[PDB]
């Protein structure tokens with residue numbers, strides 16, 4: 001028989017309650033600005049789907065970030081644009097400032113004075129991790145409440161201007177609208193941030209996917225172990241998770257949802273006990289690890305997506321008490 005269906009624990013019907021124009025991105029008509037308003041200054045990077053530059057808006061002397069797309073499905077282009085426009089003004093979500101035609105579109109973004117990822121992560125105190133985790137959660141609770149899952153939460157998609165304690169969750173190119181009963185593509189996210197639902201080919205996933213990704217980020221930060229789950233491929237990625245979370249809870253999860261496991265998996269998963277978080281603790285990371293951090297980490301990293309904390313529940317955790325107190 002087939003797998004057991006699933007529904008998001010929260011914000012289940014937020015898109016059902018909205019007019020179809022809000023989420024029917026295939027019918028979206030792109031609003032184009034003037035390409036002559038922007039002059040590229042320098043290259044920032046490149047990927048499979050884009051080339052990114054720093055640019056100057058010559059009408060107001062504003063520094064921007066220009067993402068020139070490579071050949072991508074028109075509906076996937078419309079998807080990223082629509083999600084960005086729906087999330088405009090949301091806390092800690094990057095602003096899409098404009099859209100111009102380069103052949104291909106170029107999305108124009110708000111510029112964040114990003115602190116060098118490796119220079120930043122080796123200076124972060126216990127308070128900073130808690131502070132920035134809290135800021136990512138504001139962005140996640142917001143996009144989830146607006147019926148959207150990011151599906152690509154990882155450190156490189158988080159811009160931090162540390163001097164101004166400013167955080168922006170970027171790159172909404174893999175983001176989707178959540179619809180109860182919809183089966184989504186599992187070939188999403190970066191290997192090391194892939195949820196067990198993706199790895200076992202469970203398609204009826206939801207916002208809880210971003211919470212697993214967040215757990216991966218938190219683990220790498222507090223233990224100073226990047227990446228935390230270091231798989232050699234998608235099959236071995238699950239083996240690395242099972243070596244920490246144990247195979248017992250993994251098979252209970254497979255059983256609960258009636259998941260047909262790939263014959264390849266049978267021989268490589270083996271049998272593993274659930275490890276204690278204390279084995280990743282050493283003299284170089286102990287200042288970042290506390291009983292509160294571990295309790296919060298355990299509640300994020302669950303095989304069963306329905307038993308992971310929501311972004312709102314995560315914000316009420318004791319790990320954030322001093323951050324919440326200081327913000328008032």
Ligand SMILES: CC(=O)Nc1cc(Nc2cc(NC3CC3)n3ncc(C#N)c3n2)ccc1[C@H]1C[C@@H]1CN
Nearest residue numbers: 044045046047052065067109110111112114170171
């Ligand atoms: C725009 C986006 O989604 N792609 C992407 C982003 C950056 N780099 C930067 C750098 C900064 N600021 C630092 C001072 C220069 N900022 N500030 C705001 C944004 C945005 N959005 C931003 N992007 C570099 C490379 C990529 C893409 C090609 C690679 C594929 N993964």
